[PDB]
Design an enzyme around this catalytic site. Structure first.
Site, mmCIF file in Angstrom:
data_model
loop_
_atom_site.group_PDB
_atom_site.id
_atom_site.type_symbol
_atom_site.label_atom_id
_atom_site.label_comp_id
_atom_site.label_asym_id
_atom_site.label_seq_id
_atom_site.Cartn_x
_atom_site.Cartn_y
_atom_site.Cartn_z
ATOM 1 N N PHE A 79 -1.305 -9.268 4.028
ATOM 2 C CA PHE A 79 -0.976 -8.418 5.064
ATOM 3 C C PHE A 79 0.313 -7.550 4.671
ATOM 4 O O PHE A 79 1.015 -7.954 3.910
ATOM 5 C CB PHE A 79 -0.784 -9.140 6.274
ATOM 6 C CG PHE A 79 0.224 -10.149 6.337
ATOM 7 C CD1 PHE A 79 1.495 -9.841 6.501
ATOM 8 C CD2 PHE A 79 -0.040 -11.032 5.485
ATOM 9 C CE1 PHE A 79 2.470 -10.591 6.222
ATOM 10 C CE2 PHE A 79 1.014 -12.101 5.288
ATOM 11 C CZ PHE A 79 2.439 -12.001 5.757
ATOM 12 N N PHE B 71 3.150 -6.681 3.876
ATOM 13 C CA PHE B 71 4.574 -7.053 3.262
ATOM 14 C C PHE B 71 4.753 -8.297 2.944
ATOM 15 O O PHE B 71 5.874 -8.783 2.684
ATOM 16 C CB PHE B 71 5.664 -6.068 3.841
ATOM 17 C CG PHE B 71 5.141 -4.645 4.356
ATOM 18 C CD1 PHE B 71 5.540 -4.242 5.334
ATOM 19 C CD2 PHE B 71 4.337 -3.882 3.139
ATOM 20 C CE1 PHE B 71 5.160 -2.748 5.782
ATOM 21 C CE2 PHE B 71 3.966 -2.643 3.881
ATOM 22 C CZ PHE B 71 4.198 -1.990 4.933
#
Ligand code: HAS
Ligand code: HEM
Ligand code: BNG
Ligand code: CUA
Ligand code: CU1
Lengths: 33, 557, 166
Positions: free
Chosen positions: C84, C86
């Protein structure tokens, strides 16, 4: 006037270059497999 | 509103040099973002200097999105609509629909303008591949969409003044440049299908307001339909100049016109059914469809393998004709003072490692080693940013005087020829650093300079990317300064403006008729071209369009 | 010279096609040799597998990251990985050496890369679908995970870890 010997040397360079990229990345691949 | 009689009897000469200057404009502002990207891939953060010098730039990623779109999408399509209309034009001595070759430039123009604005102002920073869920302004997916369709105007125009010429000339096989041009433009129609399907069917409903989400597998299994042949779309205008104008800038003859047809024919058959080669690492696409697609990609390489023998055979014969000597005398015999010659010949050299890289990318499992690394922009700078971009650059130096009197000076010749050599040497040095970096795992499309401590093993190719950055500015600056200097002289001498497009004679052989004749059943080959597309894309695009799992778009920027 | 440098140039033309198809066919035989060995295991599973991206943390196998590693075989563990904006989940991902790890990744936001430095695992991660790759680590250690697919301004920072237990 004959053997286009020079054009033969260029597709020979191309061939060797295709070969060493392919065979190089082919070993790297098994190394990570 | 026309005049100087050169521009009178041929006003498509005007419709050409407009395309050919919007296309250059786009190339200038794109390639600015370039040396900034190189310094980055050589761990050097030169973006303080950019945000001061162009305070409109927000992210590292904004400019790459500009770099991508203006260079690969925009510079190239326009150079393509220049050369590949105006060529079957000057050859046939006929006039393209003078009205329709203006629904093109405007069409493309405001289509460019309507995409330029939201990009310029941070609203579609989704990189040149706009893969959903990343979503951008309605105006982006509108603009670039109107822009591409501009080509559909080109296909008609040219098919049209082909099918005209045909009628006035019964029994007489299609001319060389026009044949090129007709299979070219047909292949591109059959190929624009994807990027238009995805635009109409998903990108525009989604971006206007009329759906809340797009399926990523299909938006991308469609984008690549087009995504691939579009690089063969950027290639063949340069293969045009090289098979049909370069042997005479050399002092020679295209040695076999049947071969220089067989190549183009072969791009017609096999440029479109290949896109899975960009999807090797996607889920929900069968290993056997990837495999049929792998093997097919290894075939879209045969015409370039051949292009290599024919063009070398040719330069070499020119070289012997001027007293070139042993195995290598012929290279030294060639006109190494005409940038219109030097430019595409240096590009052809960089093309040997580019295609080799390509043949690895194609080889199914081997794409796992280098997919989405820096290896990939290494590969394609040797192909579009070096060969393709360079032919064009050097074709300001024979195609330009031949579109507005203004001749080329010996000040200009010697700046055209220093530009060309630095941009070639720049590109080679970036090739090493980027290929070597990918092999060390450095990702692509990444501001790695902000994570200056993450790729310690890339220390030495990073020095290479820095050198290559400096050098491409010294070449991007001399080329800007250069491009104005030529088409900002008073100068307009209309005589070399009617010196007819400097084509080449064509060492004709006895084998020509059975062969040529065979490949002139255009209509039939076009039917094989769109059956390969149905055999390759259908069993997937349909076990897909009946499994749609659409998803909210996100803006992470 | 000139029409006899046409007699010679089109037969060489014939020889060079021969040679090149021969060469491209070796590349097909060798790619094909890889296409059944353990190394083949990294090819994403063919089969479609739809999920809801926005519900994905709020129910299903990718919802509590301590459950990501679930044995599904006598010498086989499946790792539900979620990728997801970062970061990666779990982090680190612990798996034992010698074992078939079936990785099953997906995303609640935007497309991601999942590239395990040191290995052939290099696979795209699409919101709404499950990539299923398949690998057996032969050396214990830590391996970095790099996102090699642009996902917004977090991108250059997105990294994970896999520890493979001695
Ligand atoms: C203009 C541009 C481009 C050309 C041309 C091109 C050619 C090939 N490519 Fe490619 N490419 C791929 C495979 C190939 C193959 C098999 C070929 C072939 O068509 C290449 C054949 C070329 C040759 C066989 C070379 C022959 C040499 C000649 C003809 C010059 C000879 C010298 C002479 C004649 C004279 C010498 C002079 C003297 C004086 C001696 C694959 C995979 O199979 C990927 C996906 C990889 C991944 O994971 O993303 C890929 C990715 C890309 C991307 C990235 C897209 C993105 O952003 O994701 C771009 C932009 C691109 C461009 C271009 N590519 N390619
Ligand atoms: C001074 C000249 C140029 C330099 C220094 C340069 C440098 C670069 C670098 C380092 C990247 C990789 C950045 C990254 O992956 O983060 C890149 C990307 C790219 N370049 Fe160039 N480039 C130049 C000219 C061109 C030209 C002329 C074209 C024209 C057809 C072109 C097409 C592209 C494309 C399509 C990308 C991909 C961006 C993306 O992945 O979205 N480039 N350039
Ligand atoms: C124009 C190309 C220039 C090539 C320069 C030489 C680079 C050597 C590649 O090294 C490879 O890198 C990885 C290390 O992390 C491993 O995955 C792999 O086993 C290893 O052997
Ligand atoms: Cu996730 Cu880049
Ligand atoms: Cu491609």
């Amino acid at each position: 006037e004959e053997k286009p010997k020079g054009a033969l040397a260029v597709i020979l360079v191309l061939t060797l270059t295709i070969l060493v990229f392919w065979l190089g990345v082919y070993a790297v691949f098994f190394a990570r497999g | 509103s026309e005049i100087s009689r050169v521009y009178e009897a041929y006003p498509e000469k005007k419709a050409t040099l407009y395309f050919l200057v919007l296309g250059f404009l786009a190339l200038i502002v794109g390639s600015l973002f370039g040396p900034f990207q190189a310094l980055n891939y050589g761990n050097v953060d030169a973006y303080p200097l950019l945000k001061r010098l162009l305070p409109f730039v927000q992210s590292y990623y904004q400019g790459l999105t500009l770099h991508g779109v203006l260079n690969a999408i925009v510079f190239t399509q326009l150079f393509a609509q220049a050369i590949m209309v105006y060529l079957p034009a000057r050859e046939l001595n006929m006039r393209p629909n003078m009205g329709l070759m203006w629904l093109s430039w405007w069409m493309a123009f405001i289509g460019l303008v309507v995409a330029a604005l939201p990009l310029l102002a941070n609203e579609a920073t989704v990189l040149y591949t706009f893969y959903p869920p990343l979503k951008g302004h309605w105006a982006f997916y509108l603009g670039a969409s109107v822009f591409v369709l501009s080509t559909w105007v080109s296909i008609y125009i040219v098919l049209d003044l082909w099918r005209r010429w045909k009628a006035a000339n019964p029994g007489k096989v299609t001319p060389l440049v026009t044949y090129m041009a007709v299979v070219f433009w047909l292949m591109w129609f059959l190929a624009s299908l994807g990027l238009v399907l995805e635009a109409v069917l998903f990108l525009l409903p989604w971006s206007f307001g009329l759906v809340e989400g797009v399926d990523p597998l299909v938006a991308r299994t469609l984008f690549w339909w087009t995504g691939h042949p579009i690089v063969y779309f950027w290639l063949l205008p340069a293969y045009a100049i090289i098979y049909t104008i370069l042997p005479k800038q050399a002092g020679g003859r295209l040695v076999s016109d049947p071969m220089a047809r067989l190549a183009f024919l072969l791009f017609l058959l096999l440029s479109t059914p290949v896109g899975f080669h960009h999807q090797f690492a996607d889920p929900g696409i069968d290993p056997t469809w990837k495999m049929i697609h792998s093997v097919l990609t290894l075939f879209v390489a045969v015409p370039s393998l051949m292009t290599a023998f024919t063009v070398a055979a040719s330069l070499e014969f020119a070289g012997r004709l001027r007293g070139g000597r042993g195995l290598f005398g012929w290279i030294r015999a060639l006109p190494w003072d005409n940038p219109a010659f030097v430019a595409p010949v240096l590009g052809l050299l960089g093309f040997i490692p580019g295609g080799a890289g390509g043949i690895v990318n194609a080889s199914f499992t081997l794409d796992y080693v280098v997919h989405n690394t820096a290896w990939v922009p290494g590969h394609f700078h040797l192909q579009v940013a070096s060969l393709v971009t360079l032919t064009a650059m050097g074709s300001l130096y024979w195609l330009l005087p031949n579109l507005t009197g203004k001749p080329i000076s010996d000040a200009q010749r010697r700046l055209g020829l220093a530009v060309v050599w630095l941009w070639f040497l720049g590109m080679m040095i970036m090739a090493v650093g980027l290929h070597w970096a990918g092999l060390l795992n450095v990702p692509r499309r990444a501001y790695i300079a902000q994570v200056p401590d993450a790729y310690p093993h890339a220390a030495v190719p990073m020095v290479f990317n820095v050198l290559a950055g400096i050098v491409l500015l010294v070449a991007l600056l001399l080329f800007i300064y250069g491009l104005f200097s030529v088409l900002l002289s008073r100068e307009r001498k209309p005589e070399l403006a009617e010196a007819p497009l400097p084509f080449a004679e064509v060492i004709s052989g006895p084998e020509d008729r059975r062969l040529v004749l065979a490949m002139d059943r255009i209509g039939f080959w076009f039917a094989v071209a769109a059956i390969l597309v149905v055999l390759a894309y259908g069993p997937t695009l349909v076990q897909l369009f009946g499994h749609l799992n659409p998803v909210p778009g996100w803006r992470l920027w | 010279d000139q029409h006899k440098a046409h007699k010679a140039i089109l037969a060489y033309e014939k020889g060079w096609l021969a040679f090149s198809l021969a060469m491209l066919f070796v590349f097909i035989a060798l790619i094909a040799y890889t296409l059944a060995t353990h190394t083949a295991g990294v090819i994403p599973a063919g089969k479609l597998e739809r999920v809801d991206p926005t519900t994905v943390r709020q129910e299903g196998p990718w919802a509590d990251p301590a459950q990501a590693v679930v044995q599904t075989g006598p010498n086989q563990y499946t790792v539900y990985v979620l990728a997801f904006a970062f970061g990666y989940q779990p982090n680190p991902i612990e798996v034992p050496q010698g074992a078939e790890i079936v990785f099953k990744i997906t995303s609640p936001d935007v497309i991601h890369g999942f590239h395990v430095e040191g290995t052939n695992i290099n696979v795209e991660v699409l919101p709404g679908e499950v990539s299923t790759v398949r690998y057996t680590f032969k050396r214990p250690g830590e391996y970095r995970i790099i996102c090699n697919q642009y996902c917004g301004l977090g991108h250059q920072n997105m990294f994970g870890t896999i520890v493979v237990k001695e």
